[PDB]
């Protein structure tokens, strides 16, 4: 009698985020 | 920050990682040996063998 078993399990996950917010308001009739 | 002139700034950072591993090994063995021997010097033509 001979018996052999082999199991394999691999899981991968990656997440990346990036934001960018910039505002400009110049008022020394002139407005921005 | 804003004073006499305006200055704008923005930054964001986010990182996520997930690793995984799974292993399973199973084995089974069995061995059995049975032998039977019978020698009879009875003295009958048929009954000794029987």
UniProtKB/Swiss-Prot annotation, chain A:
Marked site positions, Cleavage: 31-32
Whole-protein coverage range: 218 to 266 of 559
Organism, scientific name: Homo sapiens (Human)
TM annotation in the entry: 18-25
Protein's UniProt name: Complement component C9a
Coiled-coil regions, chain positions: none
Swiss-Prot record, chain B:
UniProt record similarity statement: Belongs to the complement C6/C7/C8/C9 family.
Transmembrane segments: 7-12
Disorder: Complement component 8 deficiency, 1: A rare defect of the complement classical pathway associated with susceptibility to severe recurrent infections, predominantly by Neisseria gonorrhoeae or Neisseria meningitidis.
Parent-protein start and end of this portion: 384 to 433 of 584
Function: Component of the membrane attack complex (MAC), a multiprotein complex activated by the complement cascade, which inserts into a target cell membrane and forms a pore, leading to target cell membrane rupture and cell lysis. The MAC is initiated by proteolytic cleavage of C5 into complement C5b in response to the classical, alternative, lectin and GZMK complement pathways. The complement pathways consist in a cascade of proteins that leads to phagocytosis and breakdown of pathogens and signaling that strengthens the adaptive immune system.
Compartments reported by the entry: Secreted; Target cell membrane
Name assigned to this protein: Complement component C8 alpha chain
Highest taxon of source: Eukaryota
Record's subunit section: Heterotrimer of 3 chains: alpha (C8A), beta (C8B) and gamma (C8G); the alpha and gamma chains are disulfide bonded. Component of the membrane attack complex (MAC), composed of complement C5b, C6, C7, C8A, C8B, C8G and multiple copies of the pore-forming subunit C9.
């Amino acid at each position: 009698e001979e018996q052999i078993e082999a199991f394999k399990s691999i899981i991968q996950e990656k997440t990346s985020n990036f934001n960018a917010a910039i505002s400009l308001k110049f008022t020394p009739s002139l407005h921005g | 920050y804003e004073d006499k002139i305006n200055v704008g700034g923005g930054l964001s950072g986010d990182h996520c990682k997930k690793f995984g591993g799974g292993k399973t090994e199973r084995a089974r063995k069995a061995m059995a040996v049975e032998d039977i021997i019978s020698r009879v010097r009875g003295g009958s033509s048929g009954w000794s063998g029987g």
